[PDB]
Ligand binder design. Structure first.
Ligand SMILES: O=c1[nH]cc(Br)cc1O
Ligand SMILES: O=c1[nH]cc(Br)cc1O
Ligand SMILES: O=c1[nH]cc(Br)cc1O
Ligand SMILES: [Mn+2]
Ligand SMILES: [Mn+2]
Ligand SMILES: [Mn+2]
Ligand SMILES: [Mn+2]
Length: 200
């Protein structure tokens, strides 16, 4: 088949909000999305997974975690997760500091992806085109904050999480895995996958 451009793929297959946040992040770190294109797709993918991990998860009036998949959550519901990824540096640390000095949870050395108000911990999300165990160890060795929970997804459906604690129900994680499989399949139709996989 014809070889498509990763640029076209990203713009067609991700929400404009996600694409814009990804471009802003790459700029901040001095990478050009029109040149590091496999990286731009990876950043979008990771951001989307962070959002999906958060979606539909609330804390109810009794303080219990619940799932609301309709469009309207009753006004008394609280989002279960704080999303750190996607924010610029200053705002991201502002949010982390607020959580920390409030909940008593200790300050991570690197910006994590999420904070879980049910489990009372930061989460680092990872999305890998390689074996989940290898990537898990890489993340763990990088942060070693060792209060930060790590949850790794691969494009082929494997997961690895700290202490075999997967935080979410199967259905939620299935949504994420389905999305990753969709991304892989579409890239493959455009002959973009092989190179995207090998670039990590
Ligand atoms: O948190 C980030 N680190 C590095 C890159 Br490139 C993009 C991010 O959002
Ligand atoms: O937290 C992350 N930020 C950006 C990238 Br690319 C990967 C991450 O795990
Ligand atoms: O995730 C990010 N979003 C925006 C900026 Br600027 C930097 C990030 O790491
Ligand atoms: Mn809301
Ligand atoms: Mn970021
Ligand atoms: Mn992050
Ligand atoms: Mn991450």
């Amino acid at each position: 088949g014809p070889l498509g451009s990763m640029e076209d793929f990203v713009r067609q297959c991700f929400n404009p909000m996600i694409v814009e946040l990804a471009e802003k992040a790459m700029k901040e770190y001095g990478e050009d999305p029109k040149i590091e294109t496999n990286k731009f797709a990876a950043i979008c993918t990771h951001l989307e997974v962070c959002f999906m991990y958060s979606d539909f998860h609330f804390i109810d009036e009794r303080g219990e975690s619940i799932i609301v998949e309709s469009g309207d959550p009753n006004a008394l519901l609280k989002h279960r997760f704080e999303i750190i990824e996607g924010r610029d540096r200053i705002m991201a640390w502002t949010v982390v500091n607020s959580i920390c000095n409030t909940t008593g949870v200790e300050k991570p050395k690197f910006l994590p992806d999420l904070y879980d108000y049910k489990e009372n911990r930061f989460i680092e999300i990872g999305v890998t085109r390689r074996e989940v165990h290898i990537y898990y160890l890489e993340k763990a060795n990088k942060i070693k904050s060792e209060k930060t929970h790590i949850h790794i997804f691969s494009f082929t459906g494997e997961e690895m999480a700290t202490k075999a604690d997967y935080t979410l129900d199967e259905e939620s994680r299935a949504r994420i895995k389905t999305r990753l499989f969709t991304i892989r399949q579409e890239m493959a139709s455009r002959s973009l996958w092989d190179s995207f996989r090998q670039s990590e």
